[PDB]
Structures are given as C-alpha cells and as structure tokens.
C-alpha cells in the first residue's frame, strides 16, 4: 500500500482527536471541493474546508474538525465512502436515461 498519497499532519492533529489536517499528493480542487462538500453534510463535522498550499507543489490539504463521539479520520472515511455511493447514483441515473431515450 502506497503511503505517500494520504498523510496525517501530526503538527496540527489534535491530541485526541476530532480536529486534524490531512495532506493528499497529486490532487487539487477536483477531489478537494467535492470531498469537503460531502464531509460538511456529516452532522458531527463542526468545521471543514480544503486548502491548496501552492499551485506548483502537488499537494491538497483538507481540515476536518468534528464535535465529540467521532474522530476526524472517521469523518474522512465516511466522506470517501459517501462520495463513492454518490457517484454510483450519478452513474445509475445516467445509464437509465440513456435507455429511456
């Protein structure tokens, strides 16, 4: 499993353990804005946003601050799990309307 793709910035991660900043390589607005939108729908997520440190460096930062009973890692895992299901809905509706034509 490649470890360079997703990294937890411990210098900003809460001792334990709702707030934490994640750094993703080879990513930008494409996943960034889509992922923070889905993470923000979570009733446990207090604060969420994405930030690109600089255009020349291939980095994507996503901050997830939650309320209790859920870690930031869980909120990110839920965000990715929901985006996958969201895409399945888009792919299913598009196939159906192609046939409906």
């Amino acid at each position: 499993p490649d470890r360079e793709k997703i990294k937890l910035l411990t210098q900003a991660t809460s001792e334990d353990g709702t707030s934490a900043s994640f750094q993703i390589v080879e990513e930008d607005h494409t996943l960034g804005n889509a992922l923070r939108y889905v993470i923000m729908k979570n009733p446990d997520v207090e604060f969420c946003g994405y930030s690109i440190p600089h255009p020349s460096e291939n980095l994507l930062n996503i901050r997830i601050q939650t309320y209790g009973e859920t870690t930031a890692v869980d909120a990110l895992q839920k965000g990715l799990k929901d985006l996958m299901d969201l895409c399945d809905v888009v792919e299913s509706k598009f196939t159906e309307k192609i046939k409906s034509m």
Binding site: L9, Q11, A12, S14, S19, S21, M40, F47, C48, G49, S51, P53, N61, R63, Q65
Partner: protein, 147 residues
C-alpha cells in the same frame, strides 16, 4: 555567505524583517500595493456578507496552522452577525477573525480610531464608514484602504 558569523549578520542585522519603518522619517515602507487594496474596499464593505462555508474557507485560505500562522493551535471563529433567518457573517468579521488567530492570546485586542481615504458621502446617507474603528481587536466600523 560561507560562515556562521556572516549568516547571523544576514539573519539579524541586514535581514528583511526589522525594516518596517524607514529611518528617514520613521514611516512605513511595507504594505500591500494594488489588487489587495481594491479587494479590501469590497471585502470590508457593508454589502459584503458570507455563509458559514464561505467564511471558514476565507479564514483557512489565508491562515494555515501547519505553516505556523496561528497562535492558538486551533482556528477560533466568531459567531455570525446574522442569526435568523440564515446564518451570515459580515466582511469585517473576517478581518476580526484573522487578527484573533495571528495576535497572541495572552495580550488584549487592538484599540484604534483611524480614518479612510474614501469620504462617507460615497457610502450613502448617514454612514460612518470613513471612521476606522478597532475595539478589543474587532473591526466594528469603516472599510480598509491603502491608508
């Protein structure tokens, strides 16, 4: 420079920091120049409102705790200026939040009564938008110019 004594000199004497005020008149030679001045007149305008999503984005967009921009190790945020019907933040509140996260927590907020380059007449009837007011590190009146 190829030695530590020459390094120390270029980092503490000839550096670029300790140079905000020229020794000629003791006036500033550092500040934002064009887009930033035009951006500020629009962002700090009364008409400029922002949703929770928009507001928090503008905060993290310029303040990154990982790059050591914060003084509280957690981005503190002010409550909205409009609660009902929709939660909305004013443009001036972003300026208050930026100071709240970059100034030390141990020290109290800044208190300043300044003026603007833009006269009140331009902002309509009975506006006080020329008077720049900072009370306990909070922009409560006036836009921010080149001034």
């Amino acid at each position: 420079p190829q030695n530590e004594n020459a390094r120390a000199e270029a980092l503490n004497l000839a550096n670029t920091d300790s140079q905000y005020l020229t020794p000629t008149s003791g006036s500033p030679v550092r500040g934002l120049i064009q887009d930033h001045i035009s951006a500020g007149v629009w962002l700090t305008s009364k008409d400029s409102f922002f949703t929770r999503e928009q507001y928090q984005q503008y905060i993290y967009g310029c303040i990154r705790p990982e790059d050591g921009h914060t003084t509280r190790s957690k981005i503190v945020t002010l409550p909205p200026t409009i609660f009902k019907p929709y939660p909305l933040w004013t443009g001036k509140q972003i300026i208050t939040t930026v100071l709240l996260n970059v100034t030390p927590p141990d020290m109290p907020g800044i208190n300043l009564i300044s003026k603007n380059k833009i006269k009140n007449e331009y902002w309509g009837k009975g506006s006080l938008e020329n008077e720049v007011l900072f009370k306990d590190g909070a922009l409560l009146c006036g836009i921010l110019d080149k001034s």
